[PDB]
Amino acid sequence: NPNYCFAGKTSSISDLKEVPRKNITLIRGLGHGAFGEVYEGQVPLQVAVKTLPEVCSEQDELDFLMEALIISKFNHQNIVRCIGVSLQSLPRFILLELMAGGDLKSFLRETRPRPSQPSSLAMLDLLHVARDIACGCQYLEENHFIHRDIAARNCLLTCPGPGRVAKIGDFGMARDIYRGGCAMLPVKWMPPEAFMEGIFTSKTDTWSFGVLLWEIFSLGYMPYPSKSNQEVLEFVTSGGRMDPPKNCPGPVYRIMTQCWQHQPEDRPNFAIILERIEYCTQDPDVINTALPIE
Numbered sequence: 001n002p003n004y005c006f007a008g009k010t011s012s013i014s015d016l017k018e019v020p021r022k023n024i025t026l027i028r029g030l031g032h033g034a035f036g037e038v039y040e041g042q043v044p045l046q047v048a049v050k051t052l053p054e055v056c057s058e059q060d061e062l063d064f065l066m067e068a069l070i071i072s073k074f075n076h077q078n079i080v081r082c083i084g085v086s087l088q089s090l091p092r093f094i095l096l097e098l099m100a101g102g103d104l105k106s107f108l109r110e111t112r113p114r115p116s117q118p119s120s121l122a123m124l125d126l127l128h129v130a131r132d133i134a135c136g137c138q139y140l141e142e143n144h145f146i147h148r149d150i151a152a153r154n155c156l157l158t159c160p161g162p163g164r165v166a167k168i169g170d171f172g173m174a175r176d177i178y179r180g181g182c183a184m185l186p187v188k189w190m191p192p193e194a195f196m197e198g199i200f201t202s203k204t205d206t207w208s209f210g211v212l213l214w215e216i217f218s219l220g221y222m223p224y225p226s227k228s229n230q231e232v233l234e235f236v237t238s239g240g241r242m243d244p245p246k247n248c249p250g251p252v253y254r255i256m257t258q259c260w261q262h263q264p265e266d267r268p269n270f271a272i273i274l275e276r277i278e279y280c281t282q283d284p285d286v287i288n289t290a291l292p293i294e
């Protein structure tokens with residue numbers, strides 16, 4: 001069994017909280033898509049159940065174990081909790097905090113202000129999401145964990161409603177690197193030194209967060225509209241940056257452009273990003289700005 005080290009402390013599969021299988025009940029599917037399905041479950045503790053396909057390879061198995069280790073060792077309110085695992089029966093389960101709000105990309109797209117729901121979302125809602133994730137990112141940074149795929153699709157919300165809390169909910173890219181091809185690399189979330197030299201640092205996540213910010217304030221659009229991966233790659237390598245999302249306040253767009261500085265040393269750390277997000281939330285001109293209605 002493979003070891004895992006986080007914050008200088010080493011852990012193994014023996015450290016995972018094995019929950020007996022008879023205590024776990026699947027309720028409904030929530031989605032599958034990627035390698036494996038996710039169910040809503042009960043253990044009464046309500047959970048999301050990540051499953052390992054019984055038809056899988058050794059590396060799939062090791063990947064599954066590793067992400068169980070990774071998530072169980074984090075302890076922060078803006079990173080999804082692991083309730084436990086069930087690895088001693090098939091199919092194997094990872095049990096996660098149930099985030100009833102779903103993933104952030106879908107949330108933004110489905111909850112866009114609309115003539116029927118003209119006020120479904122406000123700027124403050126987006127700023128709170130941004131703060132939530134930047135807080136999780138700061139926790140990762142200060143523990144020297146590099147996520148490598150900070151993106152709306154990998155974030156979750158506790159609930160649909162106003163008191164929703166956003167958290168990072170997938171660590172599959174960090175897991176692969178810890179131990180995929182070009183076409184699957186998240187190049188649209190990657191800084192120039194990452195997709196060119198394969199160099200990753202805490203400043204890798206800063207760039208990606210800038211792109212997430214754009215995702216948030218665009219209300220769920222795909223980055224670099226109309227551009228393929230290679231076109232984005234060459235665009236960004238040449239100094240190109242995205243325009244402001246529609247109606248985006250200038251103070252918010254400024255955080256994005258600072259996150260997108262070519263030199264990683266010129267990009268803010270997450271403490272500074274949080275400061276600027278906080279300042280945006282205080283500023284009436286920012287938060288009184290109306291989001292577009294589809």
Ligand SMILES: C[C@H]1Oc2cc(cnc2N)-c2c(nn(C)c2C#N)CN(C)C(=O)c2ccc(F)cc21
Pocket residue numbers: 030031032038040048050080096097098099100101102103153154155156168169170
């Ligand atoms: C591993 C999985 O985790 C959860 C998924 C959900 C809730 N809570 C957790 N923990 C969820 C989703 N949609 N809906 C409607 C619900 C609900 N209720 C999203 N989904 C299907 C995913 O696969 C997914 C996507 C991104 C991510 F970061 C983690 C996950």
